[PDB]
Amino acid sequence: LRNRVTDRYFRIQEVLKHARHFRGRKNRCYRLAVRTVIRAFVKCTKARYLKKKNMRTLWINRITAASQEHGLKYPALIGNLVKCQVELNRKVLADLAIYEPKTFKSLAALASRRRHEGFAAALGDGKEPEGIFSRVVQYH
Amino acid sequence: RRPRFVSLRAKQNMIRRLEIEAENHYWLSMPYMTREQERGHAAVRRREAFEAIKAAATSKFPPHRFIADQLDHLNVTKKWS
Amino acid sequence: ISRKWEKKNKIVYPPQLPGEPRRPAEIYHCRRQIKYSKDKMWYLAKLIRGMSIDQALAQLEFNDKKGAKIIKEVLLEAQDMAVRDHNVEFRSNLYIAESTSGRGQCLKRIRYHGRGRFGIMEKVYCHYFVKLVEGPPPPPEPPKTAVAHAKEYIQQLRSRTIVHTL
Amino acid sequence: RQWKVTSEDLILIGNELDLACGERIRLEKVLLVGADNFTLLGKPLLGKDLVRVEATVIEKTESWPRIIMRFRKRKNFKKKRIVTTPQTVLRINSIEIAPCLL
Amino acid sequence: SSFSRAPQQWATFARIWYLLDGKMQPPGKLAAMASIRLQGLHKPVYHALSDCGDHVVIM
Amino acid sequence: AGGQWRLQQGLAANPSGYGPLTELPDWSYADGRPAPPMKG
Amino acid sequence: EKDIIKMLGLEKAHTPQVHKNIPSVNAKLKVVKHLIRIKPLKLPQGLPAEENMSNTCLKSTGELVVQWHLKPVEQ
Amino acid sequence: TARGTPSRFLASVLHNGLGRYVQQLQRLSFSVSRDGASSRGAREFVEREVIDFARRNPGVVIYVNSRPCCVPRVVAEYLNGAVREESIHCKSVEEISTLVQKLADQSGLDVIRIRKPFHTDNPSIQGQWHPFTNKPTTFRGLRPREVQD
Amino acid sequence: VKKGFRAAFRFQKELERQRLLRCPPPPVRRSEKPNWDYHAEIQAFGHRLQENFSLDLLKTAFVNSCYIKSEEAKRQQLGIVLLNLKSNQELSEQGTSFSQTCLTQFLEDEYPDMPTEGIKNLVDFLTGEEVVCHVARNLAVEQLTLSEEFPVPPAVLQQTFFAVIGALLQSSGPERTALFIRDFLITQMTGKELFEMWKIINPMGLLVEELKKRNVSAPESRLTRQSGGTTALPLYFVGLYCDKKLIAEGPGETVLVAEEEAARVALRKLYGFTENRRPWNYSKPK
Amino acid sequence: TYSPLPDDYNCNVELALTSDGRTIVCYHPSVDIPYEHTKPIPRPDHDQVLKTRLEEKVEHLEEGPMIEQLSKMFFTTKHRWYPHGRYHRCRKNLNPPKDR
Ligand SMILES: [Mg+2]
């Protein structure tokens, strides 16, 4: 019995369909497209890590932009919102800085008010009581 | 070779690691029991744990072969009347 | 081989309604197996593309290339075919809609070289296709102006949104 | 995930909630609620007697095929995988608060 | 802000002219604060693919 | 951000570690029936 | 040093594990002391009971509380 | 793949679930074969499962057409007009029962990459940011180094 | 020639798909396609919308006058008994009249400051040819409609849609039908501005008349913000001041446009149609 | 008299805490532009016998001069004003998805 491949056309159409949007001979020649579709898929898998890295860095720059409009720096805003037990991630804060400017200003004031309390505590030697916004709610 | 220099945070990272290990030396200086008291205090559990290893190791055998499984292959040609 | 261009003149459209607009006449004609290069024929085909029937003949009548006479002969019989069989009133009311060249069946011969070497030369042939449409030639597209550039640039800045956010 | 949501909007969840479509649920964790003129903050969460967020399941479907491919040159190393994670769509119905600050 | 869709989009991505006085000012400090305005880094709606830069005038 | 501060307050350096933000159920029925426990 | 980490069940990092303060166990810790953080276990409420097994919680301070209520202090 | 495939934004059909929930699945057509091992799993689904399944989804009209075929198929039509057809060729009853349930929940929209995992038509309540949001106003609104009168 | 049939069969199906792409067939009604049951598809219609429709009333809702006249013509050619079918003309008028009187009631209570003409246009928008037909085609209204021409003309589709509500009016009563209008027609103005549905001309001339009814002095237009006036990309924030009090502020590319947008901002606040207004309450009545 | 931020440009931030200290309240009313900080709008911008008919001022400009005028009135470069080939003109999506 002699066997020959009868559906080799379909074996190559599943690779050439992913190269239709390329440029040059590597969109219709299987020998060239197979080596290009592989890299297109390899980059697609590795790009899922950079997308998360790029989104956060974009949020950091956007947050830093809105902090300077209120005379604050990025270390002063994120660092001092934690000490107020306000756990807001960068995605929400960046969205707040764009669509809720008045809410972001209130958070900027809270970070600024809490920032000043730490300065007062650093001057004292523990005799003075803690600030109003420096109190920590305990969970048991 | 190209010279490499130590920055400010490189020293801080190394000092931070040194602080952790200096504290580890403290907690290892206070044993709860001595060598003589410790000896033989876990021989029963250690011996029983290995006997469980032997039980699983020596229980290796081919699985049981059922007659229902062989007859179920006749259902591949089951159809409607 | 394929000969679909000759069959494009046999499609018969249904009669139009009284309110429907006049349908322009389409004439498809071609000449097969022309002893000419398809590359060189393209320049003559590229030239007359979009020209009127009489304007195309004038440019080809004084052209020094060999294929110019061949193309003119195809246009003369296609103009005759339009009035005689395609029911065209004025034979001058035509313009070149489509005009291109296609590769023909080429033979192979042996070209001798030195040191007992040889090369394979081909007697190249080509085809010519032409489509005629009744009516005046369409006006050329005016070049884009600064007013259009300003309108495009402003519209680009009006369609941009805040990306990677809500 | 922290979602800045309002009324009558949609959110896409990358896992199954084991809930039939159309069921109305309440989101217990609310960290910040704001209005045009006033804003309330949780430390880190607001009380459940202060803000009530309710959503509705409107669609349960799988993700579009994701390509997972690994390649190493000169090693004959190549393998491709396709995954379609389940997804859930929730529509925020209403967000009401109660005067319980005092 | 109860704006219409077109004016609201136009206002957010508008260009603003800024003025800097270079008298007795180091070039780098002038360049550092001018760089962010040119790139648009001072806006919360900043994005590289969006042409949100502004005009900087230095005297 | 804030990892060292949380350790001095008796909390976890990562806010997702333990506490009402993570341990509490994320949702409940509109009627009031509690939700089944999450897999995590 | 790789083996001792496997012996102590410290494969995954940032995962607390409890061991006994005895010379034999401490002997293994003295070899990989630069890879681990050693903290005594604190029991403010004492050893967990049978009714407290489902309510225990280890904090970063080393204290093992037996009543994890997830509720703010009323004080 | 994202570049080589189309994409769309997350949305629903006629704002489903806002005032009332309407099931988007509209019709199911089953093409099973009386004879053939390919439809063995599908026939067992028709014997016990489709009757109980039709009760749970009263708004879906289910057709079970028995004709000779080599590959059983199920055709699902949705309200928006999208039609999704799937093959149940040589599948167990468990796989078929779960597959039909997924088709019931879907809204009919194309299964492609979704650009945003969220969608809101009123993203702003305090006013969308504009460059004049955090800029103080001066007396008479004078420009820098501008002299009046 | 390679021996085999599976590959040749598979290739034939692929060619047919390409042929369909090159020459797409003309659209046909869903009824003419296989797997169609007129009686079954109309029963699931009520269950899909969670309503207790009446089959006798619902069947007469999809029947159109064009279909009746065309059907009689077919039998005359064949010499073919009389048909007692009733059109949806009676039901459509009942559905149309109730829908406008119910939509007007809902808007006049949610927006008491909006004038009668403003509410009139909004009802003319929700009951408009575009909104009604978009809702109908996603509720399987076009599939069940017995029309003379396919696709169903939008004018015919609107008339059939109100017949379905008209049948629901007698079936369940007005109280239950009011929920049907609220959940399908009110939800069509979620992310849409007031003037995007009620298109007007010269908003400034309409803003003055609203302040005259309330005895408010004429607003004064003054420049509050300005950027790039001399360039091709200017931005102006024109503010309306009534008795030296700011009431609205609008941006624009030019001062005249920015003045016009400020008037539109003021009108929305007067009618209570600001973007910050509380969303429509879809919770069940108490 | 104390204020974390100057309450002049955006809104009046008023930080507060609840009695139990488990919720932070922020009252931020919007500030309106004063009447004294604005400028009036500049509304303003014979023996004739023949009507001043609309005369076209569309001056013919080559590829060179036209782009230089465009690059200066929009403060851009010359490169963006050149056309593109058919390959790039056909790849662009003429029906892109729309959000909001
Ligand atoms: Mg020789």
mmCIF file of C-alpha atoms in Angstrom, chain C residues 1-165:
data_model
loop_
_atom_site.group_PDB
_atom_site.id
_atom_site.type_symbol
_atom_site.label_atom_id
_atom_site.label_comp_id
_atom_site.label_asym_id
_atom_site.label_seq_id
_atom_site.Cartn_x
_atom_site.Cartn_y
_atom_site.Cartn_z
ATOM 1 C CA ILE C 1 -5.387 28.541 -19.936
ATOM 2 C CA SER C 2 -8.104 31.032 -18.995
ATOM 3 C CA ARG C 3 -10.306 32.977 -21.423
ATOM 4 C CA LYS C 4 -12.752 34.671 -19.062
ATOM 5 C CA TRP C 5 -12.364 38.123 -20.636
ATOM 6 C CA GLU C 6 -14.155 37.093 -23.838
ATOM 7 C CA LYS C 7 -17.133 35.799 -21.827
ATOM 8 C CA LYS C 8 -17.657 39.165 -20.109
ATOM 9 C CA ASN C 9 -19.462 40.452 -23.221
ATOM 10 C CA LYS C 10 -22.206 37.799 -23.020
ATOM 11 C CA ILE C 11 -23.786 38.764 -19.680
ATOM 12 C CA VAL C 12 -27.236 40.255 -20.309
ATOM 13 C CA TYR C 13 -28.706 42.525 -17.643
ATOM 14 C CA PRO C 14 -32.450 42.647 -16.916
ATOM 15 C CA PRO C 15 -34.429 45.529 -18.441
ATOM 16 C CA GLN C 16 -34.293 48.715 -16.397
ATOM 17 C CA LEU C 17 -37.302 50.346 -14.775
ATOM 18 C CA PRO C 18 -38.478 53.681 -16.221
ATOM 19 C CA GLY C 19 -37.240 55.536 -13.136
ATOM 20 C CA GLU C 20 -33.854 53.832 -13.173
ATOM 21 C CA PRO C 21 -30.917 55.824 -14.588
ATOM 22 C CA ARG C 22 -29.170 55.047 -17.856
ATOM 23 C CA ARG C 23 -26.648 52.218 -17.560
ATOM 24 C CA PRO C 24 -23.277 52.909 -19.226
ATOM 25 C CA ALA C 25 -22.152 50.458 -21.889
ATOM 26 C CA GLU C 26 -19.267 48.110 -21.089
ATOM 27 C CA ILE C 27 -17.169 46.545 -23.856
ATOM 28 C CA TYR C 28 -14.507 43.930 -23.117
ATOM 29 C CA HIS C 29 -11.971 43.056 -25.800
ATOM 30 C CA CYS C 30 -8.562 41.414 -25.926
ATOM 31 C CA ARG C 31 -5.938 39.987 -28.264
ATOM 32 C CA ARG C 32 -4.084 36.806 -27.335
ATOM 33 C CA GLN C 33 -0.499 35.658 -27.913
ATOM 34 C CA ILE C 34 1.182 38.905 -28.939
ATOM 35 C CA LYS C 35 4.913 38.623 -29.673
ATOM 36 C CA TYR C 36 5.832 41.358 -27.213
ATOM 37 C CA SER C 37 7.118 41.621 -23.661
ATOM 38 C CA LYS C 38 4.453 42.022 -20.989
ATOM 39 C CA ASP C 39 6.720 44.522 -19.226
ATOM 40 C CA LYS C 40 7.132 46.733 -22.296
ATOM 41 C CA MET C 41 3.449 46.382 -23.182
ATOM 42 C CA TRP C 42 2.528 47.703 -19.726
ATOM 43 C CA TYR C 43 3.951 51.174 -20.409
ATOM 44 C CA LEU C 44 1.760 51.501 -23.504
ATOM 45 C CA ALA C 45 -1.170 50.124 -21.506
ATOM 46 C CA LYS C 46 -0.390 52.430 -18.569
ATOM 47 C CA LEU C 47 -0.298 55.489 -20.841
ATOM 48 C CA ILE C 48 -3.785 55.219 -22.355
ATOM 49 C CA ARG C 49 -5.467 54.227 -19.078
ATOM 50 C CA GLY C 50 -8.296 56.688 -18.438
ATOM 51 C CA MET C 51 -7.908 58.547 -21.736
ATOM 52 C CA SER C 52 -10.724 59.045 -24.215
ATOM 53 C CA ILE C 53 -11.098 56.734 -27.199
ATOM 54 C CA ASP C 54 -9.847 59.330 -29.692
ATOM 55 C CA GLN C 55 -7.197 60.774 -27.367
ATOM 56 C CA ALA C 56 -5.724 57.310 -26.788
ATOM 57 C CA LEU C 57 -5.470 56.689 -30.539
ATOM 58 C CA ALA C 58 -3.627 59.985 -31.077
ATOM 59 C CA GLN C 59 -0.983 59.142 -28.468
ATOM 60 C CA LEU C 60 -0.466 55.651 -29.911
ATOM 61 C CA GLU C 61 -0.423 56.849 -33.536
ATOM 62 C CA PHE C 62 2.839 58.790 -33.055
ATOM 63 C CA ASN C 63 4.538 56.425 -30.590
ATOM 64 C CA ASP C 64 7.735 54.683 -31.674
ATOM 65 C CA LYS C 65 7.182 51.405 -29.800
ATOM 66 C CA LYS C 66 6.045 48.355 -31.751
ATOM 67 C CA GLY C 67 3.155 47.538 -29.419
ATOM 68 C CA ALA C 68 1.623 50.954 -30.082
ATOM 69 C CA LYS C 69 0.355 49.780 -33.473
ATOM 70 C CA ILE C 70 -0.989 46.536 -31.983
ATOM 71 C CA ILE C 71 -2.928 48.340 -29.247
ATOM 72 C CA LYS C 72 -4.372 50.849 -31.722
ATOM 73 C CA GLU C 73 -5.687 47.999 -33.875
ATOM 74 C CA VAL C 74 -7.390 46.468 -30.822
ATOM 75 C CA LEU C 75 -9.001 49.816 -29.975
ATOM 76 C CA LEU C 76 -10.230 50.296 -33.549
ATOM 77 C CA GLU C 77 -12.088 46.973 -33.617
ATOM 78 C CA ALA C 78 -13.389 47.418 -30.063
ATOM 79 C CA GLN C 79 -14.786 50.819 -31.058
ATOM 80 C CA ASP C 80 -16.398 49.150 -34.074
ATOM 81 C CA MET C 81 -17.649 46.285 -31.896
ATOM 82 C CA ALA C 82 -19.233 48.734 -29.445
ATOM 83 C CA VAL C 83 -21.434 50.461 -32.026
ATOM 84 C CA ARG C 84 -22.215 47.353 -34.081
ATOM 85 C CA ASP C 85 -23.023 44.830 -31.337
ATOM 86 C CA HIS C 86 -23.044 46.616 -27.955
ATOM 87 C CA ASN C 87 -25.571 49.267 -29.084
ATOM 88 C CA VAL C 88 -23.413 52.375 -28.648
ATOM 89 C CA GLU C 89 -24.654 55.562 -30.297
ATOM 90 C CA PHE C 90 -21.515 57.710 -30.637
ATOM 91 C CA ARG C 91 -18.245 55.898 -31.298
ATOM 92 C CA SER C 92 -16.255 58.839 -29.902
ATOM 93 C CA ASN C 93 -18.145 58.716 -26.576
ATOM 94 C CA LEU C 94 -15.813 56.131 -25.052
ATOM 95 C CA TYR C 95 -12.901 56.145 -22.620
ATOM 96 C CA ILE C 96 -10.344 53.556 -21.541
ATOM 97 C CA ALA C 97 -11.700 52.048 -18.328
ATOM 98 C CA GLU C 98 -9.326 49.092 -17.895
ATOM 99 C CA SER C 99 -6.147 48.435 -19.871
ATOM 100 C CA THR C 100 -3.369 46.078 -18.788
ATOM 101 C CA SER C 101 -1.079 43.353 -20.112
ATOM 102 C CA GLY C 102 -0.831 39.707 -19.139
ATOM 103 C CA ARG C 103 1.833 37.065 -19.577
ATOM 104 C CA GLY C 104 1.386 34.658 -22.472
ATOM 105 C CA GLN C 105 2.626 31.159 -23.173
ATOM 106 C CA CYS C 106 6.357 31.457 -23.849
ATOM 107 C CA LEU C 107 8.600 29.054 -25.742
ATOM 108 C CA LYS C 108 12.145 28.059 -24.800
ATOM 109 C CA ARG C 109 15.314 28.034 -26.901
ATOM 110 C CA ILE C 110 19.012 27.584 -26.141
ATOM 111 C CA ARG C 111 21.384 30.558 -26.280
ATOM 112 C CA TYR C 112 25.015 29.606 -26.840
ATOM 113 C CA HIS C 113 27.867 31.028 -24.759
ATOM 114 C CA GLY C 114 31.627 30.637 -24.634
ATOM 115 C CA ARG C 115 33.542 27.712 -23.143
ATOM 116 C CA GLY C 116 30.772 25.353 -24.224
ATOM 117 C CA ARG C 117 28.292 27.094 -21.920
ATOM 118 C CA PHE C 118 24.688 27.846 -22.796
ATOM 119 C CA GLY C 119 21.667 29.710 -21.494
ATOM 120 C CA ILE C 120 17.916 29.234 -21.938
ATOM 121 C CA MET C 121 16.188 32.132 -23.696
ATOM 122 C CA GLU C 122 12.413 32.470 -23.990
ATOM 123 C CA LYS C 123 10.408 33.857 -26.902
ATOM 124 C CA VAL C 124 8.191 36.012 -24.708
ATOM 125 C CA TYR C 125 4.531 36.579 -25.559
ATOM 126 C CA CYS C 126 1.894 38.713 -23.870
ATOM 127 C CA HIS C 127 -1.807 39.559 -23.916
ATOM 128 C CA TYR C 128 -3.625 42.893 -23.991
ATOM 129 C CA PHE C 129 -6.970 43.579 -22.307
ATOM 130 C CA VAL C 130 -9.133 46.668 -22.818
ATOM 131 C CA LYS C 131 -12.462 47.824 -21.389
ATOM 132 C CA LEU C 132 -14.501 50.668 -22.886
ATOM 133 C CA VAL C 133 -17.243 52.626 -21.116
ATOM 134 C CA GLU C 134 -19.770 54.814 -22.902
ATOM 135 C CA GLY C 135 -19.689 58.420 -21.754
ATOM 136 C CA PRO C 136 -17.110 61.159 -21.225
ATOM 137 C CA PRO C 137 -13.907 60.219 -19.386
ATOM 138 C CA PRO C 138 -14.129 60.853 -15.637
ATOM 139 C CA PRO C 139 -12.430 64.069 -14.503
ATOM 140 C CA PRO C 140 -9.067 63.526 -12.801
ATOM 141 C CA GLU C 141 -8.974 63.817 -9.029
ATOM 142 C CA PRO C 142 -7.866 67.340 -8.064
ATOM 143 C CA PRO C 143 -4.712 67.464 -5.938
ATOM 144 C CA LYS C 144 -5.279 67.801 -2.211
ATOM 145 C CA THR C 145 -5.269 71.423 -1.052
ATOM 146 C CA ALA C 146 -4.091 73.063 2.158
ATOM 147 C CA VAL C 147 -7.724 73.546 3.204
ATOM 148 C CA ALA C 148 -8.244 69.784 2.951
ATOM 149 C CA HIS C 149 -4.982 69.184 4.829
ATOM 150 C CA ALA C 150 -6.114 71.499 7.628
ATOM 151 C CA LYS C 151 -9.515 69.798 7.762
ATOM 152 C CA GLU C 152 -7.882 66.362 7.976
ATOM 153 C CA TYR C 153 -5.362 67.385 10.648
ATOM 154 C CA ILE C 154 -7.995 68.996 12.879
ATOM 155 C CA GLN C 155 -10.279 65.970 12.528
ATOM 156 C CA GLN C 156 -7.382 63.780 13.684
ATOM 157 C CA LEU C 157 -7.044 65.781 16.907
ATOM 158 C CA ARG C 158 -10.813 65.635 17.497
ATOM 159 C CA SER C 159 -11.011 61.824 17.321
ATOM 160 C CA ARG C 160 -8.302 61.091 19.919
ATOM 161 C CA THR C 161 -9.483 59.811 23.300
ATOM 162 C CA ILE C 162 -7.857 59.121 26.667
ATOM 163 C CA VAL C 163 -6.436 55.635 26.180
ATOM 164 C CA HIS C 164 -5.577 53.041 28.833
ATOM 165 C CA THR C 165 -8.140 54.403 31.290
#
